[PDB]
Write an enzyme that holds these catalytic residues in place. Structure first.
Site, PDB file in Angstrom:
ATOM      1  N   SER A   8       5.102  -3.067 -13.635  1.00 57.87           N
ATOM      2  CA  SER A   8       6.187  -3.250 -12.392  1.00 57.87           C
ATOM      3  C   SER A   8       7.631  -3.100 -12.758  1.00 57.87           C
ATOM      4  O   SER A   8       8.374  -2.261 -11.999  1.00 57.87           O
ATOM      5  CB  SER A   8       5.972  -4.277 -11.534  1.00 57.87           C
ATOM      6  OG  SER A   8       4.537  -4.286 -11.031  1.00 57.87           O
TER       7      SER A   8
ATOM      8  N   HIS B  77       1.414   3.979  -3.307  1.00 58.26           N
ATOM      9  CA  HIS B  77       0.995   5.355  -3.344  1.00 58.26           C
ATOM     10  C   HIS B  77       1.854   6.416  -3.691  1.00 58.26           C
ATOM     11  O   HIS B  77       1.232   7.592  -4.165  1.00 58.26           O
ATOM     12  CB  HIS B  77       0.122   5.659  -2.141  1.00 58.26           C
ATOM     13  CG  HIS B  77      -1.245   5.244  -1.968  1.00 58.26           C
ATOM     14  ND1 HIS B  77      -1.784   4.783  -0.635  1.00 58.26           N
ATOM     15  CD2 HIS B  77      -2.136   4.935  -2.733  1.00 58.26           C
ATOM     16  CE1 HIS B  77      -2.660   4.239  -0.634  1.00 58.26           C
ATOM     17  NE2 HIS B  77      -3.336   4.377  -2.099  1.00 58.26           N
TER      18      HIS B  77
ATOM     19  N   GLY C 201       0.747  -7.863 -14.538  1.00 61.56           N
ATOM     20  CA  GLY C 201       1.417  -6.924 -13.487  1.00 61.56           C
ATOM     21  C   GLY C 201       2.764  -6.603 -13.859  1.00 61.56           C
ATOM     22  O   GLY C 201       3.496  -5.461 -13.672  1.00 61.56           O
TER      23      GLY C 201
ATOM     24  N   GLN D 286       0.885  -1.206  -0.045  1.00 65.80           N
ATOM     25  CA  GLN D 286       0.153  -0.168   0.052  1.00 65.80           C
ATOM     26  C   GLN D 286       0.993   1.333   0.040  1.00 65.80           C
ATOM     27  O   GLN D 286       0.853   1.920  -0.807  1.00 65.80           O
ATOM     28  CB  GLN D 286      -0.948  -0.080   1.097  1.00 65.80           C
ATOM     29  CG  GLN D 286      -1.857   1.433   1.286  1.00 65.80           C
ATOM     30  CD  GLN D 286      -2.976   1.166   2.157  1.00 65.80           C
ATOM     31  OE1 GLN D 286      -3.832   1.700   1.985  1.00 65.80           O
ATOM     32  NE2 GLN D 286      -2.872  -0.016   2.951  1.00 65.80           N
TER      33      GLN D 286
ATOM     34  N   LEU E 288      -5.306  -2.763 -11.485  1.00 63.75           N
ATOM     35  CA  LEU E 288      -4.887  -3.971 -11.287  1.00 63.75           C
ATOM     36  C   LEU E 288      -4.035  -4.027 -10.123  1.00 63.75           C
ATOM     37  O   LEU E 288      -4.298  -5.198  -9.221  1.00 63.75           O
ATOM     38  CB  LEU E 288      -3.611  -4.120 -12.420  1.00 63.75           C
ATOM     39  CG  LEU E 288      -2.811  -5.290 -12.611  1.00 63.75           C
ATOM     40  CD1 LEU E 288      -2.016  -5.304 -13.823  1.00 63.75           C
ATOM     41  CD2 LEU E 288      -1.937  -5.469 -11.529  1.00 63.75           C
ATOM     42  N   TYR E 289      -3.350  -2.898  -9.788  1.00 53.74           N
ATOM     43  CA  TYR E 289      -2.745  -3.130  -8.341  1.00 53.74           C
ATOM     44  C   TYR E 289      -3.453  -3.074  -7.104  1.00 53.74           C
ATOM     45  O   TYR E 289      -3.187  -2.962  -5.984  1.00 53.74           O
ATOM     46  CB  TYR E 289      -1.700  -1.937  -8.495  1.00 53.74           C
ATOM     47  CG  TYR E 289      -0.429  -2.566  -7.621  1.00 53.74           C
ATOM     48  CD1 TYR E 289       0.909  -1.982  -8.287  1.00 53.74           C
ATOM     49  CD2 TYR E 289      -0.234  -3.330  -6.776  1.00 53.74           C
ATOM     50  CE1 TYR E 289       2.273  -2.233  -7.694  1.00 53.74           C
ATOM     51  CE2 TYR E 289       1.021  -3.590  -5.968  1.00 53.74           C
ATOM     52  CZ  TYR E 289       2.066  -3.090  -6.581  1.00 53.74           C
ATOM     53  OH  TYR E 289       3.475  -3.379  -5.906  1.00 53.74           O
TER      54      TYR E 289
ATOM     55  N   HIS F 200      -6.510  -5.021  -2.391  1.00 56.49           N
ATOM     56  CA  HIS F 200      -7.364  -4.729  -1.174  1.00 56.49           C
ATOM     57  C   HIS F 200      -7.599  -6.196  -0.500  1.00 56.49           C
ATOM     58  O   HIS F 200      -7.543  -6.054   0.924  1.00 56.49           O
ATOM     59  CB  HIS F 200      -8.700  -3.739  -1.383  1.00 56.49           C
ATOM     60  CG  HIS F 200      -8.393  -2.582  -1.905  1.00 56.49           C
ATOM     61  ND1 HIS F 200      -8.016  -2.061  -2.956  1.00 56.49           N
ATOM     62  CD2 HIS F 200      -8.262  -1.338  -1.098  1.00 56.49           C
ATOM     63  CE1 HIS F 200      -7.525  -0.791  -3.024  1.00 56.49           C
ATOM     64  NE2 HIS F 200      -7.886  -0.195  -1.900  1.00 56.49           N
TER      65      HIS F 200
HETATM   66  C1  COH Z   1      -2.229  -2.827  -2.976  1.00 58.52           C
HETATM   67  C2  COH Z   1      -2.337  -1.366  -2.783  1.00 58.52           C
HETATM   68  C3  COH Z   1      -3.560  -1.039  -1.755  1.00 58.52           C
HETATM   69  C4  COH Z   1      -3.626  -1.343  -0.279  1.00 58.52           C
HETATM   70  C5  COH Z   1      -3.200  -2.449   0.393  1.00 58.52           C
HETATM   71  C6  COH Z   1      -4.995  -0.537  -0.118  1.00 58.52           C
HETATM   72  C7  COH Z   1      -5.632  -0.708   1.063  1.00 58.52           C
HETATM   73  C8  COH Z   1      -6.794   0.085   1.634  1.00 58.52           C
HETATM   74  C9  COH Z   1      -7.418  -0.029   2.780  1.00 58.52           C
HETATM   75  C10 COH Z   1      -6.943  -0.851   4.107  1.00 58.52           C
HETATM   76  C11 COH Z   1      -6.643  -0.839   5.169  1.00 58.52           C
HETATM   77  C12 COH Z   1      -8.481   0.752   3.118  1.00 58.52           C
HETATM   78  C13 COH Z   1      -9.228   1.034   3.830  1.00 58.52           C
HETATM   79  C14 COH Z   1      -8.467   1.689   1.589  1.00 58.52           C
HETATM   80  C15 COH Z   1      -9.364   2.270   1.187  1.00 58.52           C
HETATM   81  C16 COH Z   1      -9.318   2.911   0.125  1.00 58.52           C
HETATM   82  N1  COH Z   1      -8.304   2.815  -0.918  1.00 58.52           N
HETATM   83 CO1  COH Z   1      -6.942   1.550  -0.919  1.00 58.52          CO
HETATM   84  N2  COH Z   1      -5.118   0.282  -1.289  1.00 58.52           N
HETATM   85  C17 COH Z   1      -4.267   0.034  -2.151  1.00 58.52           C
HETATM   86  C18 COH Z   1      -4.371   0.718  -3.425  1.00 58.52           C
HETATM   87  C19 COH Z   1      -5.134   1.894  -3.686  1.00 58.52           C
HETATM   88  C20 COH Z   1      -5.449   2.653  -5.229  1.00 58.52           C
HETATM   89  C21 COH Z   1      -4.273   2.216  -6.201  1.00 58.52           C
HETATM   90  C22 COH Z   1      -6.298   3.461  -4.996  1.00 58.52           C
HETATM   91  C23 COH Z   1      -6.871   4.384  -6.103  1.00 58.52           C
HETATM   92  C24 COH Z   1      -6.459   5.885  -5.934  1.00 58.52           C
HETATM   93  C25 COH Z   1      -5.039   6.161  -6.186  1.00 58.52           C
HETATM   94  O1  COH Z   1      -4.070   5.938  -5.425  1.00 58.52           O
HETATM   95  O2  COH Z   1      -4.784   6.354  -7.619  1.00 58.52           O
HETATM   96  C26 COH Z   1      -6.969   3.071  -3.750  1.00 58.52           C
HETATM   97  C27 COH Z   1      -8.078   3.782  -3.288  1.00 58.52           C
HETATM   98  C28 COH Z   1      -8.789   3.837  -2.059  1.00 58.52           C
HETATM   99  C29 COH Z   1      -9.818   4.511  -1.519  1.00 58.52           C
HETATM  100  C30 COH Z   1     -10.865   5.760  -2.365  1.00 58.52           C
HETATM  101  C31 COH Z   1     -11.980   5.444  -3.193  1.00 58.52           C
HETATM  102  C32 COH Z   1     -11.603   4.330  -4.239  1.00 58.52           C
HETATM  103  O3  COH Z   1     -10.902   4.557  -5.287  1.00 58.52           O
HETATM  104  O4  COH Z   1     -12.110   3.214  -4.312  1.00 58.52           O
HETATM  105  C33 COH Z   1     -10.311   4.189   0.042  1.00 58.52           C
HETATM  106  C34 COH Z   1     -11.654   4.553   0.605  1.00 58.52           C
HETATM  107  N3  COH Z   1      -6.446   1.990  -2.950  1.00 58.52           N
HETATM  108  N4  COH Z   1      -7.542   1.068   0.686  1.00 58.52           N
END
Ligand code: COH
Ligand SMILES: *[C@@H]1O[C@H](CO)[C@@H](O[C@@H]2O[C@H](CO)[C@@H](O[C@@H]3O[C@H](CO[C@@H]4O[C@H](CO)[C@@H](O)[C@H](O)[C@@H]4O)[C@@H](O)[C@H](O)[C@@H]3O)[C@H](O)[C@H]2NC(C)=O)[C@H](O)[C@H]1NC(C)=O
Ligand SMILES: *[C@@H]1O[C@H](CO)[C@@H](O[C@@H]2O[C@H](CO)[C@@H](O[C@@H]3O[C@H](CO[C@@H]4O[C@H](CO)[C@@H](O)[C@H](O)[C@@H]4O)[C@@H](O)[C@H](O)[C@@H]3O)[C@H](O)[C@H]2NC(C)=O)[C@H](O)[C@H]1NC(C)=O
Ligand code: COH
Ligand SMILES: *[C@@H]1O[C@H](CO)[C@@H](O[C@H]2O[C@H](CO)[C@@H](O)[C@H](O)[C@H]2NC(C)=O)[C@H](O)[C@H]1NC(C)=O
Ligand SMILES: *[C@@H]1O[C@H](CO)[C@@H](O[C@H]2O[C@H](CO)[C@@H](O)[C@H](O)[C@H]2NC(C)=O)[C@H](O)[C@H]1NC(C)=O
Ligand SMILES: *[C@@H]1O[C@H](CO)[C@@H](O[C@H]2O[C@H](CO)[C@@H](O)[C@H](O)[C@H]2NC(C)=O)[C@H](O)[C@H]1NC(C)=O
Ligand SMILES: *[C@@H]1O[C@H](CO)[C@@H](O[C@H]2O[C@H](CO)[C@@H](O)[C@H](O)[C@H]2NC(C)=O)[C@H](O)[C@H]1NC(C)=O
Ligand SMILES: CCCCC/C=C\C/C=C\C/C=C\C/C=C\CCCC(=O)O
Ligand SMILES: CCCCC/C=C\C/C=C\C/C=C\C/C=C\CCCC(=O)O
Ligand SMILES: CCCCCCCCO[C@@H]1O[C@H](CO)[C@@H](O)[C@H](O)[C@H]1O
Ligand SMILES: CCCCCCCCO[C@@H]1O[C@H](CO)[C@@H](O)[C@H](O)[C@H]1O
Ligand SMILES: CCCCCCCCO[C@@H]1O[C@H](CO)[C@@H](O)[C@H](O)[C@H]1O
Ligand SMILES: CCCCCCCCO[C@@H]1O[C@H](CO)[C@@H](O)[C@H](O)[C@H]1O
Ligand SMILES: CCCCCCCCO[C@@H]1O[C@H](CO)[C@@H](O)[C@H](O)[C@H]1O
Ligand SMILES: CCCCCCCCO[C@@H]1O[C@H](CO)[C@@H](O)[C@H](O)[C@H]1O
Ligand SMILES: CCCCCCCCO[C@@H]1O[C@H](CO)[C@@H](O)[C@H](O)[C@H]1O
Ligand SMILES: CCCCCCCCO[C@@H]1O[C@H](CO)[C@@H](O)[C@H](O)[C@H]1O
Lengths: 553, 553
Positions: free
Chosen positions: B499, B176, B495, B172, B353-354, B357
């Site tokens: 990457s 970002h 992927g 995560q 793709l990445y 969640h």
């Molecule tokens: C493998 C990477 C990864 C992880 C582990 C992760 C883990 C988590 C997590 C667990 C604690 C929570 C509560 C969230 C919650 C969110 N994530 Co992510 N996210 C991740 C990659 C992303 C990406 C990529 C986006 C889209 C926005 C961007 O960064 O361009 C994202 C967007 C979101 C959004 C905004 C709305 C949407 O685009 O759907 C929320 C809320 N999330 N995420």
């Protein structure tokens, strides 16, 4: 103590770096040399350097075999050299880029902050004895003096190569799409991001300005019929921010894309020609692809201009300048087998070097007329009065001035020259010799050796005090130019690697973009593959006047 | 009539383009194929494609030769593959980049407007029958439904590969720095310019924010001693714009560089660790080079982090994920003989793709404790309460969830998944099969073939109506994952090329930068060449806890 890197100990591009308090180390990594200061050729590089002829000799060849060349020119032995001239030349330009006004070391900021111009050699450590390094007088020659003493024109020494003003302006026009310094951020920075041939001296250097210039219909650019002929639109129909003199802002005050293109009929002229073309190609495209929207009928149109431009610059512009017998040739595929980074980045040193101001005449002859700077500069009625055709046929006839030798910068513009050396000092560019090295040459041993004569030579010595502290802009212009060349040795040897590195480093030149689709259909491609100077004009005019980068007869 | 490019007639990356009113043409240039639709292999490509094994088989090898691999791993046969895995993989990513949310064709704007994310395949023509192209029901499955029907977790199916949350968060955190969409410009755009591993999730994504974060002394970053341990500074000492909940903005409200890193102890944790390191390396540098100013003791410090990061990601992060027996290896020189463009550009498809969640658990166990999302999310006291060490030893133990198979996205975050498909629809990404092709695979012939079972298979058919209209994000997650793999086939096959293309496309990875000087001295280089995950932690802590990208035992 003395900052050890003030002697420029490291050779052949070896990185100098302070260690401890008074020590230093050279990074000869891939320098091609080993050792403390990078002065021990490896078996191979030693072969390379021994079987390597004088740059002065290679020039000799490129300019003598009337017959050998007419033959090498009609066979593959042509592309082979062209492909060689490219690779070798542009290999002397770091890519990715290295430094800037703010960093004398490798850095992420330098890498990503497009705002900066970039340098080949680091700067002269701010804490060095001489302002040039270690040698010389602790006071550089009174800038304004030098300018009048050695660069100020006396008798107009014209280009022996036959160059003309039709060329001079193109040179100017063209070069401004990447050379755009801002007083805002100051020297060492640039507005013209994108760096290179993007025509951001047409479509403007920011999205907004483009839009405010685009007629958002059939993908063309706004314009106005003045006397039947097409011309750029006025700021009254296009809010583009220009630099005209507080005069008649409404009409006659045209919007072009290059903020300054109003201060000279030539630059506006061209700005016109290209614009004429652009729309011209749109007409062409829209026929092959009616379904096409505005944006496409615009992007594709643009690209075709980046082609035609990159095209003309090499096979005709560069040709004339060089004087080579080898027919320069633009063909992206010549590098499809080479290792090349398809990205360029304008360099401050490139900037300073491209100052061919001495190309500009004493006056500007337009047929029986004969306009003085005063009546030419900022003039307005001239472009729309004479008309493209006739006004081109005029520059294609009046000779340009010789860039080399020294003493050829007309007094009106002579002020520029002084700010170049002043800025050069601002930036802290190492000495000529230091730059002669990095571009594969030997440092001049004496002032006398630098200039054919002995007068300026001595006088220059009782000023800098050592050939080793001579400056960048002064040495380039003051160097004994080649036999019948338009300018000295160092000019091409230093100029070429920048010019091509960026001329072919354009994304369109890569395999990824170099396809007929990138120009929608064959027509697009064939336009880029067929661009002529004689066509950029005569295809966008009523009549075909004389046009070339050199005077007739 | 029907926009002919709605059938996606062109094969093997052939450019489709409307000619006339109802006609089209494929640009098989270097497609490797000739013909109307690019379906006639040239002698060679035909050899290539016949002597070419199933991607499914190559996976088999990479995951079976316990012995053959222990040997290939201890010899050069290692770098040879690694060097192969790289080149081949990243050759499937266009470079320079091709399209965006606004251009389904090659363009200068697309090239220079960093603001855009980029695409591999164009979009689904806005004027096509089905919203997917030609096949399927004129109404895509009710987004929110699908999400609960197939992606919504039931029973927590953990990663068979041994992955843990210590990995999940890094994933995560790391991702970002390049994935940063803005509601401002909307989907298809990105704040995180620079694209790639620049740590702009540390030093911030704009110069200002960096400065407002930098302690402008000895090149370190501001910070604060909480309990003896170091942590990021609070916004009360650093005006960095964060996203915390209207709570206790003063203390506990830390500034990191990645606007959102406060909403989770993991992301903050890491943000901390790296910061700890950064300053840590500064200490190191400043000793080797005292004379060094602030900027240098900062840029060099940064770069060492881009190294260590790019390093860990490949040799450890990527390793664990892949499950290969071949020891992945980070060594820029493996491409010094290859033709490679040292530049990357994040892609919308890469983005979608990445979304791992489903890696996130049900709850978050920290020793005997056991925090619920509610008490974990936006929590604050947790990071500084438990302390890095112990709080790492916690994630390095609790397993991650399996990304593949389907039905594994916890309900709390399950909302994300729905916006991905919603956005995917916003963007108009062609169908799964269409993307399966471009990444060297064959399209699934039936829904049944796509998923190991038959239930979801049928149910999915009575929804999309044809395997050919299946979506991108859904297919990736819903694909029968490999035997004991963490996710399906298509995940790695699609992927990897993104990457690595960007992982090695970083400027530091080029010959121009890959020198000991770029990290001031050997110490710098050796830090990048020795980065471990176990070191990024234990070197910046009081004690060495258990740490790895996989659970112990
Ligand atoms: C493998 C990477 C990864 C992880 C582990 C992760 C883990 C988590 C997590 C667990 C604690 C929570 C509560 C969230 C919650 C969110 N994530 Co992510 N996210 C991740 C990659 C992303 C990406 C990529 C986006 C889209 C926005 C961007 O960064 O361009 C994202 C967007 C979101 C959004 C905004 C709305 C949407 O685009 O759907 C929320 C809320 N999330 N995420
Ligand atoms: C490429 O680099 C150039 C040069 O760095 C960027 O332009 C320059 O950007 C910097 C930062 O935005 C400008 O710096 C000035 O800094 C002073 C001092 O700041 C003050 O002191 C500290 C800061 O740490 C704080 O405590 C104070 O609150 C306050 O911020 C500030 O007062 C000025 O307003 C200004 O920010 C610099 O002026 C600016 N111009 C140039 C050319 O030097 C350029 O943005 C960058 N390009 C990109 C796109 O990143
Ligand atoms: C990368 O591309 C994106 C997307 O193009 C850039 O962001 C977007 O930039 C455009 C132009 O600045 C914004 O367009 C809007 O246009 C309306 C309409 O303009 C009006 O109509 C005509 C214009 O021809 C005139 O006669 C009127 O006077 C008026 O200008 C305008 O009202 C809006 O204010 C705005 O300019 C668009 O809103 C903007 N945002 C996005 C993401 O779409 C982005 O800047 C670019 N990146 C870079 C650095 O170039
Ligand atoms: C070969 C290109 C070329 C030509 C033919 C040319 C022809 C002429 C010309 C003849 C009609 C006049 C009156 C000027 C006048 C000027 N030029 Co030029 N210039 C040229 C390339 C440049 C460059 C490059 C700069 C520096 C600014 C930049 O663009 O970055 C410049 C700057 C200037 C400046 C600003 C001050 C300075 O930097 O010294 C003036 C005034 N000029 N120039
Ligand atoms: C490397 O280059 C430096 C240039 O400064 C050489 O300088 C050193 O040697 C000089 C004699 O030639 C001494 O007089 C100087 O005091 C000394 N200066 C320095 C940098 O300490 C140095 O000898 C060169 N080394 C080699 C092997 O050529
Ligand atoms: C600007 O240039 C124009 C050329 O078009 C000049 O035009 C006028 O002056 C010429 C000689 O000085 C005459 O020969 C032209 O016939 C006359 N043009 C007409 C009919 O209007 C003009 O004087 C110049 N102005 C400046 C700035 O000096
Ligand atoms: C190229 O691909 C197109 C896909 O649409 C093929 O489609 C054409 O041929 C079909 C028969 O297979 C006809 O039923 C369609 O009307 C027709 N559609 C189009 C695009 O006009 C086309 O045959 C393919 N060409 C080859 C040689 O494979
Ligand atoms: C935030 O997380 C912290 C963990 O540091 C929680 O801490 C308190 O609650 C725990 C169980 O709910 C106790 O076991 C801890 O001892 C207690 N920490 C102390 C001593 O302050 C906290 O409740 C969480 N808050 C939220 C947002 O739910
Ligand atoms: C642009 C300004 C100066 C450039 C100098 C020489 C470039 C002209 C032709 C290219 C080949 C030159 C060579 O490689 O010999
Ligand atoms: C990052 C997110 C997904 C990447 C998928 C696989 C990458 C992991 C290791 C690289 C080698 C993989 C290969 O080339 O087989
Ligand atoms: C046998 C190979 C072909 C004939 C080679 C002739 C070399 C001429 O000699 C060249 O003359 C130039 C005069 O400007 C000098 O500048 C060069 O240094 C010199 O190499
Ligand atoms: C035209 C009457 C004079 C004969 C020479 C004309 C110019 C071309 O003569 C050249 O001389 C060279 C010597 O360097 C030969 O090597 C070339 O092959 C030849 O083309
Ligand atoms: C007959 C000439 C064939 C082509 C020779 C190479 C063309 C470029 O020329 C060479 O470029 C190198 C890079 O700047 C320099 O080191 C050399 O001095 C220069 O002569
Ligand atoms: C007290 C605040 C200290 C801020 C230090 C920021 C250093 C930025 O760096 C400066 O950038 C300038 C333009 O970008 C360059 O001209 C300078 O040479 C360079 O030192
Ligand atoms: C003789 C060469 C070494 C032994 C080759 C064994 C090939 C095993 O076969 C592989 O089994 C996989 C099972 O998951 C399938 O997915 C692949 O399609 C298949 O190629
Ligand atoms: C350890 C007792 C069982 C013997 C096999 C152990 C696992 C490693 O056995 C592997 O089997 C392969 C078959 O595909 C061989 O090709 C490999 O060389 C061998 O390493
Ligand atoms: C034993 C395996 C040695 C290395 C094989 C190549 C590693 C990368 O793998 C290959 O990458 C290509 C690009 O995506 C794809 O076309 C293939 O399907 C894939 O297997
Ligand atoms: C009347 C004014 C017409 C202006 C036309 C500008 C077209 C810009 O292009 C638009 O850019 C958007 C974001 O950059 C994309 O999302 C759109 O798909 C694209 O059409």
């Amino acid at each position: 103590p003395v900052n050890p890197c003030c002697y420029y100990p490291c050779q052949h591009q070896g990185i100098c770096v302070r260690f401890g308090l008074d020590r230093y180390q050279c990074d000869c990594t891939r320098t091609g040399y080993s050792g403390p200061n990078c002065t021990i050729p490896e078996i191979w590089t030693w072969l390379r350097t021994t079987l390597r002829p004088s740059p002065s000799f290679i020039h000799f060849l490129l300019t003598h075999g009337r017959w050998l060349w007419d033959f090498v020119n009609a066979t593959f032995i042509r592309d082979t050299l062209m492909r060689l001239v490219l690779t070798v030349r542009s290999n002397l330009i770091p890519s990715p880029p290295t430094y800037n006004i703010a960093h004398d070391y490798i850095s992420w900021e330098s890498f990503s902050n497009v705002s900066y111009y970039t340098r080949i050699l680091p700067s002269v450590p701010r804490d060095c004895p001489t302002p040039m390094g270690t040698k010389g007088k602790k006071q550089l020659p009174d800038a304004e003096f030098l300018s009048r003493r050695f660069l100020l024109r006396r008798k107009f020494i014209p280009d022996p190569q036959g160059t003309n003003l039709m060329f001079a302006f193109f040179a100017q026009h063209f070069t401004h799409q990447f050379f755009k310094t801002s007083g805002k951020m100051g020297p060492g920075f640039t507005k013209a991001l994108g760096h290179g041939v993007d025509l951001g001296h047409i479509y403007g250097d920011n999205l907004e300005r483009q839009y405010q210039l685009r007629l958002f219909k059939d993908g063309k650019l706004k314009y106005q019929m003045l006397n039947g002929e097409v011309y750029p639109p006025s700021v009254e129909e296009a809010p583009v921010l220009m630099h005209y003199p507080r005069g008649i802002p409404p009409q006659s005050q045209m919007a072009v894309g290059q903020e300054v293109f109003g201060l000279l009929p030539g630059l506006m002229l061209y700005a016109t020609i290209w614009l004429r073309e652009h729309n011209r190609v749109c007409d062409l495209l829209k026929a092959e692809h009616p379904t096409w929207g505005d944006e496409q009928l615009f992007q594709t149109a643009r690209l075709i201009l980046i082609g035609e431009t990159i095209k003309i610059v090499i096979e005709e512009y560069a040709q004339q300048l060089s004087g080579y017998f080898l027919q320069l040739k633009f063909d992206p595929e010549l590098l499809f087998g080479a290792q090349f980074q398809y990205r360029n980045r304008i360099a401050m040193e490139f900037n300073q070097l491209y100052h061919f101001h001495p190309l500009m005449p004493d006056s500007f002859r337009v047929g029986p007329q004969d306009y003085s700077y005063e009546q030419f500069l900022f003039n307005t009625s001239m472009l729309v009065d004479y008309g493209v055709e006739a006004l081109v046929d005029a520059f294609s006839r009046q000779p340009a001035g010789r860039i080399g030798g020294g003493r050829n910068i007309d007094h009106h513009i002579l002020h520029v020259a002084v700010d170049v050396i002043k800025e050069s000092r601002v930036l802290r560019l190492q000495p000529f010799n230091e730059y002669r090295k990095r571009f594969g040459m030997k440092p001049y041993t004496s002032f006398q050796e630098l200039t054919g004569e002995k007068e300026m030579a001595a006088e220059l010595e009782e000023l800098y005090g050592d050939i080793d502290a001579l400056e960048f802009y002064p040495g380039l212009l003051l160097e004994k130019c080649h036999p019948n060349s338009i300018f000295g040795e160092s000019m091409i040897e230093m100029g070429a690697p920048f010019s091509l590195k960026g001329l072919l480093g354009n994304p369109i030149c890569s395999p990824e973009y170099w396809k007929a689709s990138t120009f929608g259909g064959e027509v697009g491609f064939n336009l880029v593959k067929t661009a002529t100077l004689k066509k950029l004009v005569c295809l966008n005019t009523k009549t075909c006047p004389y046009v070339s980068f050199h005077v007739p007869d």
